[PDB]
Amino acid sequence: SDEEILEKLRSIVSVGDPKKKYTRFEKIGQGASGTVYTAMDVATGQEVAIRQMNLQQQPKKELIINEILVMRENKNPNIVNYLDSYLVGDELWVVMEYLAGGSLTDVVTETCMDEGQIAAVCRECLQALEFLHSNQVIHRDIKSDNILLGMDGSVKLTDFGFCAQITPEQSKRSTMVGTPYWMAPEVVTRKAYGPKVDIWSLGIMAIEMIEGEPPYLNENPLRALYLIATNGTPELQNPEKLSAIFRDFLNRCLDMDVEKRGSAKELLQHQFLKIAKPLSSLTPLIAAAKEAT
């Protein structure tokens, strides 16, 4: 009930209006997710990203509550920090840290990453995934768009608007919520999938870093899903150009047999990650992609 949902949010949020705690607001995005502003914590100085939503015009408010509760209880260096929330009437404000380096999508579409840089990003993403999976959380919408970058090269996962919490019981999910092109075959074929759907998505993200886009991007989303389910593991355009260890890493992320696919815990030990360059090696690419926009 809209009423109960408001009381629930009321219990979660900090009290009052945010207009005192933040200053130089600047409007960025303005989709259906709400209006997003950059702003400055007046008390810490930290630049933040604030999403403002009008509840009565927000469809699935349970997902928003789930997102806040999950973020609040699963803080991690490789997850964009959830800072606070406020409710003013039917207006809900969610405050996140702001990363000035844009997203991984900007980097893979505007620059050419080398294997050392790719290994670094893959490692940081696997750190977030191992942590989440160890805490029974499946992100379910892993893709470059949801990987934000700091100017120093920090790599953080965001958007828990589609995550799932599992248990011994209800250890598997069925709900098709992720973005088509990055979805694991088992999500579309068969039912009941587990945490490894995020591992498959990470492999597709690695293809993005190599080729600039996930396989089948050119296709209608409806057709990509059928292809993903009927073609299985994607084929690289120029596999010979990659090192044997990177090809092995991709093969482990994109195996069809879920049992055979690597878990986050297993892949964190992969030798491909050991060739990672320092995270600051990403700064030049992030700068180039930001100006190119």
PDB file of C-alpha atoms in Angstrom:
ATOM      1  CA  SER A   1       0.000   0.000   0.000  1.00  0.00           C
ATOM      2  CA  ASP A   2       1.164   3.495  -0.953  1.00  0.00           C
ATOM      3  CA  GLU A   3       0.523   4.454   2.672  1.00  0.00           C
ATOM      4  CA  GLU A   4       2.572   1.612   4.187  1.00  0.00           C
ATOM      5  CA  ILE A   5       5.323   2.287   1.655  1.00  0.00           C
ATOM      6  CA  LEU A   6       5.552   5.868   2.867  1.00  0.00           C
ATOM      7  CA  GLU A   7       5.768   4.813   6.510  1.00  0.00           C
ATOM      8  CA  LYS A   8       8.460   2.300   5.536  1.00  0.00           C
ATOM      9  CA  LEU A   9      10.439   4.945   3.709  1.00  0.00           C
ATOM     10  CA  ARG A  10       9.827   7.320   6.628  1.00  0.00           C
ATOM     11  CA  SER A  11      11.554   4.883   8.975  1.00  0.00           C
ATOM     12  CA  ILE A  12      14.539   4.484   6.615  1.00  0.00           C
ATOM     13  CA  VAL A  13      15.245   8.117   5.793  1.00  0.00           C
ATOM     14  CA  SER A  14      17.101  10.730   7.790  1.00  0.00           C
ATOM     15  CA  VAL A  15      14.841  13.516   9.072  1.00  0.00           C
ATOM     16  CA  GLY A  16      14.028  16.833   7.461  1.00  0.00           C
ATOM     17  CA  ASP A  17      14.865  18.506   4.194  1.00  0.00           C
ATOM     18  CA  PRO A  18      18.159  17.972   2.317  1.00  0.00           C
ATOM     19  CA  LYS A  19      18.267  21.564   1.056  1.00  0.00           C
ATOM     20  CA  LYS A  20      20.304  22.532   4.117  1.00  0.00           C
ATOM     21  CA  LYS A  21      22.911  19.754   3.934  1.00  0.00           C
ATOM     22  CA  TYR A  22      23.774  20.306   0.244  1.00  0.00           C
ATOM     23  CA  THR A  23      24.435  23.433  -1.855  1.00  0.00           C
ATOM     24  CA  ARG A  24      25.535  23.932  -5.482  1.00  0.00           C
ATOM     25  CA  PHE A  25      22.893  21.666  -7.056  1.00  0.00           C
ATOM     26  CA  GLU A  26      23.301  20.935 -10.769  1.00  0.00           C
ATOM     27  CA  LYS A  27      20.786  18.930 -12.789  1.00  0.00           C
ATOM     28  CA  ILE A  28      22.202  16.070 -14.827  1.00  0.00           C
ATOM     29  CA  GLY A  29      19.926  13.207 -15.822  1.00  0.00           C
ATOM     30  CA  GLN A  30      16.147  13.519 -15.850  1.00  0.00           C
ATOM     31  CA  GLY A  31      14.735  10.191 -16.990  1.00  0.00           C
ATOM     32  CA  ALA A  32      11.928   8.142 -15.464  1.00  0.00           C
ATOM     33  CA  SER A  33      14.255   7.142 -12.632  1.00  0.00           C
ATOM     34  CA  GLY A  34      13.847  10.683 -11.347  1.00  0.00           C
ATOM     35  CA  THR A  35      15.867  13.868 -11.601  1.00  0.00           C
ATOM     36  CA  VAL A  36      19.544  13.482 -10.819  1.00  0.00           C
ATOM     37  CA  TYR A  37      21.625  16.347  -9.477  1.00  0.00           C
ATOM     38  CA  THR A  38      25.254  16.770  -8.526  1.00  0.00           C
ATOM     39  CA  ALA A  39      25.721  18.712  -5.298  1.00  0.00           C
ATOM     40  CA  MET A  40      28.070  19.370  -2.400  1.00  0.00           C
ATOM     41  CA  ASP A  41      27.775  18.083   1.194  1.00  0.00           C
ATOM     42  CA  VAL A  42      28.199  21.317   3.049  1.00  0.00           C
ATOM     43  CA  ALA A  43      29.614  19.568   6.117  1.00  0.00           C
ATOM     44  CA  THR A  44      32.210  17.252   4.533  1.00  0.00           C
ATOM     45  CA  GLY A  45      32.760  19.056   1.225  1.00  0.00           C
ATOM     46  CA  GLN A  46      32.149  15.843  -0.685  1.00  0.00           C
ATOM     47  CA  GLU A  47      30.514  16.221  -4.103  1.00  0.00           C
ATOM     48  CA  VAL A  48      27.518  13.895  -4.299  1.00  0.00           C
ATOM     49  CA  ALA A  49      24.941  12.703  -6.789  1.00  0.00           C
ATOM     50  CA  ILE A  50      21.341  13.161  -5.648  1.00  0.00           C
ATOM     51  CA  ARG A  51      18.360  11.434  -7.281  1.00  0.00           C
ATOM     52  CA  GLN A  52      15.021  13.100  -6.612  1.00  0.00           C
ATOM     53  CA  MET A  53      11.860  11.148  -7.252  1.00  0.00           C
ATOM     54  CA  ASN A  54       8.209  11.993  -6.956  1.00  0.00           C
ATOM     55  CA  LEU A  55       6.811   8.872  -5.313  1.00  0.00           C
ATOM     56  CA  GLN A  56       3.206   9.020  -6.495  1.00  0.00           C
ATOM     57  CA  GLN A  57       4.677   8.870  -9.998  1.00  0.00           C
ATOM     58  CA  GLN A  58       7.188   6.112  -9.271  1.00  0.00           C
ATOM     59  CA  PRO A  59       5.815   2.669 -10.286  1.00  0.00           C
ATOM     60  CA  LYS A  60       7.557  -0.033  -8.240  1.00  0.00           C
ATOM     61  CA  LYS A  61       8.439   1.695  -4.966  1.00  0.00           C
ATOM     62  CA  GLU A  62       9.210  -1.651  -3.309  1.00  0.00           C
ATOM     63  CA  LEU A  63      12.256  -1.908  -5.584  1.00  0.00           C
ATOM     64  CA  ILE A  64      13.462   1.497  -4.402  1.00  0.00           C
ATOM     65  CA  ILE A  65      13.125   0.456  -0.751  1.00  0.00           C
ATOM     66  CA  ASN A  66      14.915  -2.817  -1.565  1.00  0.00           C
ATOM     67  CA  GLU A  67      17.671  -0.898  -3.307  1.00  0.00           C
ATOM     68  CA  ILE A  68      18.249   1.363  -0.289  1.00  0.00           C
ATOM     69  CA  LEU A  69      18.174  -1.448   2.248  1.00  0.00           C
ATOM     70  CA  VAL A  70      20.567  -3.572   0.212  1.00  0.00           C
ATOM     71  CA  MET A  71      22.989  -0.713  -0.375  1.00  0.00           C
ATOM     72  CA  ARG A  72      22.865   0.352   3.280  1.00  0.00           C
ATOM     73  CA  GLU A  73      23.808  -3.135   4.531  1.00  0.00           C
ATOM     74  CA  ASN A  74      26.306  -4.091   1.830  1.00  0.00           C
ATOM     75  CA  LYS A  75      28.850  -1.283   1.785  1.00  0.00           C
ATOM     76  CA  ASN A  76      32.069  -2.146  -0.038  1.00  0.00           C
ATOM     77  CA  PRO A  77      35.042  -0.279  -1.597  1.00  0.00           C
ATOM     78  CA  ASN A  78      33.938  -1.510  -5.044  1.00  0.00           C
ATOM     79  CA  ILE A  79      30.320  -0.430  -4.728  1.00  0.00           C
ATOM     80  CA  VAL A  80      29.289   3.223  -5.189  1.00  0.00           C
ATOM     81  CA  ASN A  81      28.654   4.484  -1.630  1.00  0.00           C
ATOM     82  CA  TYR A  82      25.026   5.062  -0.590  1.00  0.00           C
ATOM     83  CA  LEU A  83      25.147   8.053   1.722  1.00  0.00           C
ATOM     84  CA  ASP A  84      21.664   8.969   2.918  1.00  0.00           C
ATOM     85  CA  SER A  85      18.053   9.514   1.942  1.00  0.00           C
ATOM     86  CA  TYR A  86      15.356  12.043   2.751  1.00  0.00           C
ATOM     87  CA  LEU A  87      11.639  12.160   2.240  1.00  0.00           C
ATOM     88  CA  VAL A  88       9.867  15.477   1.848  1.00  0.00           C
ATOM     89  CA  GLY A  89       6.207  14.749   1.226  1.00  0.00           C
ATOM     90  CA  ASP A  90       6.025  12.356  -1.719  1.00  0.00           C
ATOM     91  CA  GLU A  91       9.428  13.569  -2.783  1.00  0.00           C
ATOM     92  CA  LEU A  92      12.182  11.049  -2.075  1.00  0.00           C
ATOM     93  CA  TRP A  93      15.860  11.971  -2.307  1.00  0.00           C
ATOM     94  CA  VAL A  94      18.635   9.356  -2.477  1.00  0.00           C
ATOM     95  CA  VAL A  95      22.175  10.580  -1.969  1.00  0.00           C
ATOM     96  CA  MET A  96      25.131   8.634  -3.441  1.00  0.00           C
ATOM     97  CA  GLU A  97      28.812   9.483  -3.695  1.00  0.00           C
ATOM     98  CA  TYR A  98      29.659  11.044  -7.054  1.00  0.00           C
ATOM     99  CA  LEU A  99      32.349   9.579  -9.256  1.00  0.00           C
ATOM    100  CA  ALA A 100      33.700  12.176 -11.694  1.00  0.00           C
ATOM    101  CA  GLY A 101      35.167   9.718 -14.202  1.00  0.00           C
ATOM    102  CA  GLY A 102      31.896   8.749 -15.839  1.00  0.00           C
ATOM    103  CA  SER A 103      31.076   5.109 -16.664  1.00  0.00           C
ATOM    104  CA  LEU A 104      32.932   2.151 -18.195  1.00  0.00           C
ATOM    105  CA  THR A 105      30.645   2.536 -21.228  1.00  0.00           C
ATOM    106  CA  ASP A 106      32.244   5.921 -21.998  1.00  0.00           C
ATOM    107  CA  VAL A 107      35.694   4.310 -21.806  1.00  0.00           C
ATOM    108  CA  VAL A 108      34.954   1.301 -24.024  1.00  0.00           C
ATOM    109  CA  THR A 109      33.183   3.368 -26.672  1.00  0.00           C
ATOM    110  CA  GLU A 110      35.727   6.195 -26.812  1.00  0.00           C
ATOM    111  CA  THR A 111      39.102   4.550 -26.051  1.00  0.00           C
ATOM    112  CA  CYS A 112      41.053   1.305 -26.545  1.00  0.00           C
ATOM    113  CA  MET A 113      41.875  -0.516 -23.285  1.00  0.00           C
ATOM    114  CA  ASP A 114      44.966  -2.744 -23.091  1.00  0.00           C
ATOM    115  CA  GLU A 115      44.902  -6.145 -21.321  1.00  0.00           C
ATOM    116  CA  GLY A 116      46.556  -4.738 -18.203  1.00  0.00           C
ATOM    117  CA  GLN A 117      43.833  -2.099 -17.901  1.00  0.00           C
ATOM    118  CA  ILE A 118      41.080  -4.626 -18.657  1.00  0.00           C
ATOM    119  CA  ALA A 119      42.452  -7.051 -16.024  1.00  0.00           C
ATOM    120  CA  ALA A 120      42.328  -4.227 -13.442  1.00  0.00           C
ATOM    121  CA  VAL A 121      38.678  -3.432 -14.120  1.00  0.00           C
ATOM    122  CA  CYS A 122      37.762  -7.149 -14.171  1.00  0.00           C
ATOM    123  CA  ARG A 123      39.492  -7.646 -10.828  1.00  0.00           C
ATOM    124  CA  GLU A 124      37.749  -4.701  -9.171  1.00  0.00           C
ATOM    125  CA  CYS A 125      34.342  -5.888 -10.488  1.00  0.00           C
ATOM    126  CA  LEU A 126      35.049  -9.437  -9.279  1.00  0.00           C
ATOM    127  CA  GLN A 127      35.873  -8.020  -5.828  1.00  0.00           C
ATOM    128  CA  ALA A 128      32.426  -6.420  -5.675  1.00  0.00           C
ATOM    129  CA  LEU A 129      30.766  -9.633  -6.961  1.00  0.00           C
ATOM    130  CA  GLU A 130      32.572 -11.975  -4.581  1.00  0.00           C
ATOM    131  CA  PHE A 131      31.463  -9.732  -1.706  1.00  0.00           C
ATOM    132  CA  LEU A 132      27.841  -9.534  -2.864  1.00  0.00           C
ATOM    133  CA  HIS A 133      27.554 -13.227  -3.688  1.00  0.00           C
ATOM    134  CA  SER A 134      29.097 -14.136  -0.312  1.00  0.00           C
ATOM    135  CA  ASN A 135      26.323 -12.027   1.187  1.00  0.00           C
ATOM    136  CA  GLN A 136      23.581 -13.675  -0.877  1.00  0.00           C
ATOM    137  CA  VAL A 137      23.045 -10.768  -3.216  1.00  0.00           C
ATOM    138  CA  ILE A 138      22.891 -11.160  -7.003  1.00  0.00           C
ATOM    139  CA  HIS A 139      23.244  -7.864  -8.847  1.00  0.00           C
ATOM    140  CA  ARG A 140      21.483  -9.174 -11.990  1.00  0.00           C
ATOM    141  CA  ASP A 141      22.215  -6.191 -14.234  1.00  0.00           C
ATOM    142  CA  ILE A 142      25.972  -6.144 -14.595  1.00  0.00           C
ATOM    143  CA  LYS A 143      27.039  -4.105 -17.672  1.00  0.00           C
ATOM    144  CA  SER A 144      29.489  -1.282 -18.443  1.00  0.00           C
ATOM    145  CA  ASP A 145      26.797   1.330 -17.850  1.00  0.00           C
ATOM    146  CA  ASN A 146      26.634   0.236 -14.226  1.00  0.00           C
ATOM    147  CA  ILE A 147      30.373   0.485 -13.632  1.00  0.00           C
ATOM    148  CA  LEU A 148      31.285   4.009 -12.545  1.00  0.00           C
ATOM    149  CA  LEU A 149      34.841   5.292 -12.498  1.00  0.00           C
ATOM    150  CA  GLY A 150      36.649   7.759 -10.268  1.00  0.00           C
ATOM    151  CA  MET A 151      39.217  10.163 -11.711  1.00  0.00           C
ATOM    152  CA  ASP A 152      41.858   8.198  -9.840  1.00  0.00           C
ATOM    153  CA  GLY A 153      40.846   5.004 -11.575  1.00  0.00           C
ATOM    154  CA  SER A 154      38.577   3.630  -8.840  1.00  0.00           C
ATOM    155  CA  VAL A 155      36.058   1.128 -10.203  1.00  0.00           C
ATOM    156  CA  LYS A 156      32.669   0.800  -8.520  1.00  0.00           C
ATOM    157  CA  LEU A 157      29.482  -1.087  -9.250  1.00  0.00           C
ATOM    158  CA  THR A 158      26.143   0.700  -8.954  1.00  0.00           C
ATOM    159  CA  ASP A 159      22.365   0.376  -9.507  1.00  0.00           C
ATOM    160  CA  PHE A 160      20.868  -2.182  -7.198  1.00  0.00           C
ATOM    161  CA  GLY A 161      17.454  -1.475  -8.647  1.00  0.00           C
ATOM    162  CA  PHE A 162      17.318  -5.075  -9.926  1.00  0.00           C
ATOM    163  CA  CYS A 163      19.230  -7.091  -7.347  1.00  0.00           C
ATOM    164  CA  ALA A 164      17.987 -10.209  -5.624  1.00  0.00           C
ATOM    165  CA  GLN A 165      18.633 -11.631  -2.189  1.00  0.00           C
ATOM    166  CA  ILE A 166      18.702 -15.409  -2.004  1.00  0.00           C
ATOM    167  CA  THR A 167      18.892 -18.006   0.815  1.00  0.00           C
ATOM    168  CA  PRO A 168      19.478 -21.721   1.276  1.00  0.00           C
ATOM    169  CA  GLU A 169      15.775 -22.284   0.473  1.00  0.00           C
ATOM    170  CA  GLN A 170      15.145 -19.799  -2.313  1.00  0.00           C
ATOM    171  CA  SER A 171      18.696 -20.084  -3.640  1.00  0.00           C
ATOM    172  CA  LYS A 172      17.619 -19.586  -7.281  1.00  0.00           C
ATOM    173  CA  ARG A 173      15.657 -16.811  -9.154  1.00  0.00           C
ATOM    174  CA  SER A 174      13.480 -16.771 -12.292  1.00  0.00           C
ATOM    175  CA  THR A 175      12.586 -13.153 -12.859  1.00  0.00           C
ATOM    176  CA  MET A 176      13.964 -11.788 -16.119  1.00  0.00           C
ATOM    177  CA  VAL A 177      15.222  -8.363 -15.035  1.00  0.00           C
ATOM    178  CA  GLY A 178      18.658  -7.832 -16.569  1.00  0.00           C
ATOM    179  CA  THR A 179      19.602  -6.089 -19.820  1.00  0.00           C
ATOM    180  CA  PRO A 180      19.149  -8.511 -22.794  1.00  0.00           C
ATOM    181  CA  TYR A 181      22.602  -8.341 -24.331  1.00  0.00           C
ATOM    182  CA  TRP A 182      24.336  -9.159 -21.049  1.00  0.00           C
ATOM    183  CA  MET A 183      21.950 -11.906 -19.918  1.00  0.00           C
ATOM    184  CA  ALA A 184      23.155 -15.418 -19.214  1.00  0.00           C
ATOM    185  CA  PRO A 185      21.604 -18.217 -21.326  1.00  0.00           C
ATOM    186  CA  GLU A 186      19.983 -19.862 -18.314  1.00  0.00           C
ATOM    187  CA  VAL A 187      17.964 -16.713 -17.553  1.00  0.00           C
ATOM    188  CA  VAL A 188      16.118 -17.055 -20.845  1.00  0.00           C
ATOM    189  CA  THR A 189      16.398 -20.834 -21.240  1.00  0.00           C
ATOM    190  CA  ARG A 190      15.240 -22.928 -18.306  1.00  0.00           C
ATOM    191  CA  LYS A 191      14.226 -21.240 -15.060  1.00  0.00           C
ATOM    192  CA  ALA A 192      16.057 -20.980 -11.737  1.00  0.00           C
ATOM    193  CA  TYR A 193      19.396 -19.221 -12.114  1.00  0.00           C
ATOM    194  CA  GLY A 194      21.943 -18.307  -9.496  1.00  0.00           C
ATOM    195  CA  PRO A 195      24.767 -15.862  -8.727  1.00  0.00           C
ATOM    196  CA  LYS A 196      26.753 -16.963 -11.774  1.00  0.00           C
ATOM    197  CA  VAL A 197      24.496 -14.903 -14.022  1.00  0.00           C
ATOM    198  CA  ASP A 198      26.623 -11.949 -12.849  1.00  0.00           C
ATOM    199  CA  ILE A 199      29.791 -13.818 -13.887  1.00  0.00           C
ATOM    200  CA  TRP A 200      28.430 -14.342 -17.385  1.00  0.00           C
ATOM    201  CA  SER A 201      27.538 -10.630 -17.544  1.00  0.00           C
ATOM    202  CA  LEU A 202      31.073  -9.732 -16.499  1.00  0.00           C
ATOM    203  CA  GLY A 203      32.381 -11.824 -19.404  1.00  0.00           C
ATOM    204  CA  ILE A 204      30.151  -9.878 -21.756  1.00  0.00           C
ATOM    205  CA  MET A 205      31.543  -6.699 -20.206  1.00  0.00           C
ATOM    206  CA  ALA A 206      35.049  -7.961 -20.957  1.00  0.00           C
ATOM    207  CA  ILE A 207      33.929  -8.411 -24.573  1.00  0.00           C
ATOM    208  CA  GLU A 208      32.797  -4.748 -24.442  1.00  0.00           C
ATOM    209  CA  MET A 209      36.289  -3.743 -23.301  1.00  0.00           C
ATOM    210  CA  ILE A 210      37.828  -5.743 -26.130  1.00  0.00           C
ATOM    211  CA  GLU A 211      35.395  -5.009 -29.001  1.00  0.00           C
ATOM    212  CA  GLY A 212      33.520  -1.860 -27.956  1.00  0.00           C
ATOM    213  CA  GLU A 213      30.109  -3.512 -27.587  1.00  0.00           C
ATOM    214  CA  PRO A 214      28.478  -6.741 -26.303  1.00  0.00           C
ATOM    215  CA  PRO A 215      27.674  -9.372 -28.903  1.00  0.00           C
ATOM    216  CA  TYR A 216      24.506  -8.800 -30.969  1.00  0.00           C
ATOM    217  CA  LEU A 217      24.061  -5.152 -29.884  1.00  0.00           C
ATOM    218  CA  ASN A 218      23.070  -4.546 -33.507  1.00  0.00           C
ATOM    219  CA  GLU A 219      20.085  -6.842 -33.043  1.00  0.00           C
ATOM    220  CA  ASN A 220      16.611  -6.246 -31.675  1.00  0.00           C
ATOM    221  CA  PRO A 221      16.788  -7.144 -27.930  1.00  0.00           C
ATOM    222  CA  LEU A 222      14.172  -9.832 -28.510  1.00  0.00           C
ATOM    223  CA  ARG A 223      16.412 -11.481 -31.120  1.00  0.00           C
ATOM    224  CA  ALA A 224      19.610 -11.216 -29.068  1.00  0.00           C
ATOM    225  CA  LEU A 225      18.030 -13.232 -26.255  1.00  0.00           C
ATOM    226  CA  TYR A 226      17.129 -16.046 -28.651  1.00  0.00           C
ATOM    227  CA  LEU A 227      20.635 -15.918 -30.145  1.00  0.00           C
ATOM    228  CA  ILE A 228      22.286 -15.911 -26.711  1.00  0.00           C
ATOM    229  CA  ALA A 229      20.267 -19.007 -25.792  1.00  0.00           C
ATOM    230  CA  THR A 230      20.860 -20.763 -29.116  1.00  0.00           C
ATOM    231  CA  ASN A 231      24.466 -19.806 -29.849  1.00  0.00           C
ATOM    232  CA  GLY A 232      25.823 -20.213 -26.355  1.00  0.00           C
ATOM    233  CA  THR A 233      29.251 -18.756 -25.607  1.00  0.00           C
ATOM    234  CA  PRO A 234      29.987 -15.719 -27.869  1.00  0.00           C
ATOM    235  CA  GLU A 235      32.757 -15.873 -30.500  1.00  0.00           C
ATOM    236  CA  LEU A 236      35.427 -13.128 -30.576  1.00  0.00           C
ATOM    237  CA  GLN A 237      36.077 -11.272 -33.819  1.00  0.00           C
ATOM    238  CA  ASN A 238      39.896 -11.422 -33.442  1.00  0.00           C
ATOM    239  CA  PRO A 239      40.716 -14.036 -30.720  1.00  0.00           C
ATOM    240  CA  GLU A 240      44.295 -14.397 -31.909  1.00  0.00           C
ATOM    241  CA  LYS A 241      44.974 -10.845 -30.834  1.00  0.00           C
ATOM    242  CA  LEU A 242      44.415 -11.772 -27.147  1.00  0.00           C
ATOM    243  CA  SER A 243      46.811 -13.492 -24.763  1.00  0.00           C
ATOM    244  CA  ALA A 244      46.176 -17.107 -23.925  1.00  0.00           C
ATOM    245  CA  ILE A 245      45.474 -16.227 -20.283  1.00  0.00           C
ATOM    246  CA  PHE A 246      42.859 -13.602 -21.158  1.00  0.00           C
ATOM    247  CA  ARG A 247      41.177 -16.094 -23.513  1.00  0.00           C
ATOM    248  CA  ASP A 248      41.126 -18.645 -20.706  1.00  0.00           C
ATOM    249  CA  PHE A 249      39.602 -16.078 -18.355  1.00  0.00           C
ATOM    250  CA  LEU A 250      36.848 -15.242 -20.884  1.00  0.00           C
ATOM    251  CA  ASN A 251      36.204 -18.934 -21.480  1.00  0.00           C
ATOM    252  CA  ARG A 252      35.669 -19.404 -17.694  1.00  0.00           C
ATOM    253  CA  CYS A 253      33.235 -16.462 -17.484  1.00  0.00           C
ATOM    254  CA  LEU A 254      31.261 -17.471 -20.524  1.00  0.00           C
ATOM    255  CA  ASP A 255      30.856 -21.236 -20.111  1.00  0.00           C
ATOM    256  CA  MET A 256      27.381 -22.557 -20.869  1.00  0.00           C
ATOM    257  CA  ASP A 257      27.381 -25.131 -18.158  1.00  0.00           C
ATOM    258  CA  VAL A 258      26.657 -23.114 -15.010  1.00  0.00           C
ATOM    259  CA  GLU A 259      28.377 -25.723 -12.889  1.00  0.00           C
ATOM    260  CA  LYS A 260      31.493 -25.330 -15.087  1.00  0.00           C
ATOM    261  CA  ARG A 261      31.333 -21.535 -15.146  1.00  0.00           C
ATOM    262  CA  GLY A 262      33.656 -19.846 -12.705  1.00  0.00           C
ATOM    263  CA  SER A 263      32.338 -18.455  -9.420  1.00  0.00           C
ATOM    264  CA  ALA A 264      33.515 -14.997  -8.314  1.00  0.00           C
ATOM    265  CA  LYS A 265      35.621 -16.595  -5.577  1.00  0.00           C
ATOM    266  CA  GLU A 266      37.301 -18.861  -8.168  1.00  0.00           C
ATOM    267  CA  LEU A 267      37.914 -16.155 -10.774  1.00  0.00           C
ATOM    268  CA  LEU A 268      39.477 -13.783  -8.240  1.00  0.00           C
ATOM    269  CA  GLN A 269      42.357 -16.301  -8.189  1.00  0.00           C
ATOM    270  CA  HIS A 270      42.703 -16.304 -11.982  1.00  0.00           C
ATOM    271  CA  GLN A 271      46.122 -15.520 -13.389  1.00  0.00           C
ATOM    272  CA  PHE A 272      44.675 -13.077 -15.911  1.00  0.00           C
ATOM    273  CA  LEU A 273      43.988 -10.737 -12.971  1.00  0.00           C
ATOM    274  CA  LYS A 274      47.627 -10.820 -11.976  1.00  0.00           C
ATOM    275  CA  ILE A 275      48.644  -8.860 -15.059  1.00  0.00           C
ATOM    276  CA  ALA A 276      46.470  -5.947 -13.905  1.00  0.00           C
ATOM    277  CA  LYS A 277      48.151  -2.572 -14.074  1.00  0.00           C
ATOM    278  CA  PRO A 278      47.749  -0.079 -11.207  1.00  0.00           C
ATOM    279  CA  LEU A 279      44.285   1.511 -11.242  1.00  0.00           C
ATOM    280  CA  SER A 280      45.773   4.900 -12.022  1.00  0.00           C
ATOM    281  CA  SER A 281      46.653   3.434 -15.445  1.00  0.00           C
ATOM    282  CA  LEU A 282      42.979   4.066 -16.254  1.00  0.00           C
ATOM    283  CA  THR A 283      43.140   7.821 -15.667  1.00  0.00           C
ATOM    284  CA  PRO A 284      44.287   8.773 -19.186  1.00  0.00           C
ATOM    285  CA  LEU A 285      41.414   6.738 -20.737  1.00  0.00           C
ATOM    286  CA  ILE A 286      38.884   8.127 -18.308  1.00  0.00           C
ATOM    287  CA  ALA A 287      40.083  11.671 -19.084  1.00  0.00           C
ATOM    288  CA  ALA A 288      39.936  11.051 -22.830  1.00  0.00           C
ATOM    289  CA  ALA A 289      36.445   9.534 -22.641  1.00  0.00           C
ATOM    290  CA  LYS A 290      35.156  12.375 -20.441  1.00  0.00           C
ATOM    291  CA  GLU A 291      36.241  15.086 -22.888  1.00  0.00           C
ATOM    292  CA  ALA A 292      35.033  13.060 -25.853  1.00  0.00           C
ATOM    293  CA  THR A 293      32.159  12.891 -23.387  1.00  0.00           C
TER     294      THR A 293
END
